[PDB]
Each structure stands twice: as C-alpha cells, then as structure tokens.
C-alpha cells in the first residue's frame, strides 16, 4: 500500500534547470527519509542525495552538493529534486526511493527520464503495421505500430488501453539519421479474432503532449 510516484521529467536545454516530484502515499510521510538515485542509459545506479521530511534537511553526495537541492513539502507528502546547470552527462532515469530499516531502499518510484539536449521536441507520427494473415488463415498473426520521428525519449505504447498484454513486444527505440527516434510495437493474435476484436495502439509521448490512438485494421 506504500507508493512513490514520480513526475517532472523531460527535455531540458544544457545549462538549464528542472524540478522533479515524488508523491508518497500509504504511510506517514514524516517517518521515513526520501532519496534520489539516477541511472544513465546502459550504466548503473548512482546515489544523489536524500531528505528527512521531519526536519527538512538533506544530505548530498559530494558530486552533486553544489548543483542540486532537495526540498520536501509535508502537507502534500511530496519530495522535490531541483537540478541546476544541467549538462549532457546528467541525462538519466531519476528515481526516488524510501529508506527503511538498516538504511535500505524498500520502495522505489517508477523513474522519470531526463534528457539534456538543445534539440527541439518532436511529437511522434503513428502508422499501422497491418496484420499479415487474413481472418481465414488458421494460425497466429502479427500486427503492429510504427512510431516514427519523435524526440526525445520516451514514448509509452500500449495495446487496447493496456487490456492486451500477452504476446506484446515493444522494441527499444533506434536513433535515426535525422536525429529523431523511431520504434515499433507488435502483438501476435489469433487470426480468427481479426474480424471481431478491435486492436488499437495507444501512443503517448509526454515531452510534446501527444496522445494518439491508432486503430490497426487488416489489408
């Protein structure tokens, strides 16, 4: 019942600043310190710092102490990470985590990706990958969605608003020659269901506030 949910990530120009939020619930916010940990793409975990909401003070790794601040607003059960003078090496997934027991992190947020870049945001174009079999073919069929020319990462792709889960593969994005990302999301289904079950691919790219729902139909 304990939950930490983050928000705030996105695209930021170098030398700029950004503020991330961590909403805590399911426990008395004042009885547990809250920390931030980042993870560069492909690299490992790195501790940033933490705050004690009972007092309001914070510790920092010597790598970030001058540049980042951590505050907490106890009335909203929220912790905040203010990041200043951001550089390309600050591009990473940022997590909040609650400390409990002998100084372990027992509840983590989902992570929010921060990208430090001077390129402008680009919303994705969403195209169908029409199913391979006909409704009379007899086996399994593959169908999909192409999410082209967006920036920056990430996009969230789901199928039938998340009700369709088994057999779904959303591939890692690939940085194209143009400098924009592109990925595909496929699902395999029974051929017989092609004429009756609606298949919709929901794409959400926050940086550009794009929410597209693309229906995939045969032929």
């Amino acid at each position: 019942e304990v939950q930490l949910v983050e928000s705030g990530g996105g695209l930021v120009q170098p030398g700029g600043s950004l503020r991330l939020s961590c909403a805590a619930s399911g426990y008395t916010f004042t009885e547990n310190t809250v920390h931030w940990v980042r993870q560069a793409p492909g690299k490992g975990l790195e501790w940033i710092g933490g705050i004690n909401p009972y007092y309001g003070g914070s510790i920092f790794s010597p790598k970030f102490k001058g540049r980042f601040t951590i505050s907490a607003d106890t009335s909203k059960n929220t912790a905040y990470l203010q990041m200043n003078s951001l550089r390309a090496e600050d591009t990473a997934v940022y997590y909040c985590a609650r400390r409990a027991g002998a100084y372990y992190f027992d509840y983590w947020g989902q992570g929010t990706l921060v990208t430090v870049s001077s390129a402008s945001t680009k919303g994705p174009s969403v195209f169908p990958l029409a199913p391979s079999s006909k409704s009379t073919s007899g086996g399994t069929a593959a169908l999909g969605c192409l999410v082209k020319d967006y920036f920056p990462e990430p996009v969230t792709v789901s199928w039938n608003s998340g009700a369709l889960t088994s057999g779904v593969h959303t591939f890692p994005a690939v940085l194209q020659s143009s400098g924009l990302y592109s990925l595909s999301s496929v699902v395999t289904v029974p051929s017989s269901s092609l004429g009756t079950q609606t298949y919709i691919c929901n794409v959400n790219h926050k940086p550009s506030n794009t929410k597209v729902d693309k229906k995939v139909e045969p032929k």
């Binding site: 940990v37 169908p128 391979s132 593959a142 999909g144 192409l146 890692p172």
Partner: protein, 215 residues
C-alpha cells in the same frame, strides 16, 4: 568505500546455482550491505537486506552471506523470471553516504528456438507523407544472434536499415528482433519485390518473407 562487483554478466541454465560477489573496500558492517534486483525498464526491487535477510515475498532460493571483505548473493535454483541486473548497496555510518556496485546482468541459457518471421509493407498513411518503411519481425527465438538481410528486386541492401532487439523474455527467455528498411516514396515506388531473409542457429535453411508492391 568503493564497491567492486563481479562478474559483469553471466549466463546460466534454469535450475543452476549463480553467485555474485561485491567486494567492499574498507570495512562495512554486515547490517549496511543490501542487494537489489532490477528487471528491464523497471525500478530496483529490494531482494536482500543486511547481508542475509530476505525481503518480504522474495523466494528463498535467494540468499546472501559475507566472508570477510567479500559479500555474496546466491540464487540456488535459477528460474527464467530471475533475468535481471543485480546491484549491491552499501551505507556508511560516518558520512550517511550510499554507494552502489556497478551491476551484474544474469541471462538465462535455454534451448535453441527458431524465430517466426513476419513482413509488414508500408502503410498508405505513411506513403502519403513521402516515406516508406518496410518492417521485418523475428518473434521469440534463442540464441540472440540473428542475421536479417534485405533484398529489393533481389538486390542486396546495406546502410538503409536499422534493427532493434528486445531484452530476454521473463517467461520463456527468448528474444525478438525488428528490422526496418526505409526508402523514399520515389525509390519505393520504383521497385516491386521486397523480401527479408533470415538466418538463425535454429534454422537449417534461411527463411524468406516477401511481398510485391501492389497485391
């Protein structure tokens, strides 16, 4: 206090016993060394705390111990859902600082599985925009090494396709691959036969999927 984690990655079959070691330079109390499991795209999950204590709901095939300067996470019977990257964490009481090991990726070794190949022509919607992307999908295979080669009117393509491989599946430990050939509307409309040819350790003969622009 700098942690050193080993190995960087390992491959083991289902039912095998894996061990990961974090060597703590300096002296860390057994109470302040923990182990986390991170599945792809997810947040780290606490597996073991204070060297040897299992977290709630964590299967007891996980265990941990310390032998001097060295800490050890052990999975007694490896299972496919254990595919993850594992991190140790240490807390120092002098400075309140935390340090993480650099991580150990645990891949599952399984029997060879041949891919299922599908080909998707570009959509009319995308052609109305001036570009054409042909997609080739390899579904649920092992091992990961695969070769997808594009042929347009039997001519071999190069430098106009990008591919992408999923992480290992947590159910059946397979991979999937997506290869995208991109052309302009002009070039796409100037050719007729489009094929991807796949070679994989599980295929005795390469598999070809193709369509003809039109039908």
């Amino acid at each position: 206090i700098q942690m050193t984690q080993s190995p960087s990655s390992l491959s083991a079959s289902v039912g095998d016993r894996v061990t990961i070691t974090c060597r703590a330079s300096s002296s860390v109390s057994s109470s302040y060394l923990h182990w986390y499991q991170q599945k792809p795209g997810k947040a780290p999950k606490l597996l073991i705390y204070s060297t040897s204590n299992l977290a709630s709901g964590v299967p007891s095939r996980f265990s941990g111990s310390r032998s001097g300067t060295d800490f050890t996470l052990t999975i007694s019977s490896l299972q496919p859902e254990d595919f993850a990257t594992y991190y140790c964490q240490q807390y120092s009481r002098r400075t309140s600082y935390r340090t993480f090991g650099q991580g150990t990726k645990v891949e599952i070794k399984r029997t060879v599985a041949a891919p299922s190949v599908f080909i998707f022509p570009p959509s009319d919607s995308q052609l109305k925009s001036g570009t054409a992307s042909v997609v080739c999908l390899l579904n649920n295979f092992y091992p990961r090494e695969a070769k997808v080669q594009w042929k347009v009117d039997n001519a071999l393509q190069s430098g106009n396709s990008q591919e992408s491989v999923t992480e290992q599946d947590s159910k059946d430990s397979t991979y999937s691959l997506s290869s995208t050939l991109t052309l302009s509307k002009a070039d796409y409309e100037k050719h007729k036969v489009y094929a991807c040819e796949v070679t994989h350790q599980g295929l005795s003969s390469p598999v070809t999927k193709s369509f003809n622009r039109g039908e």
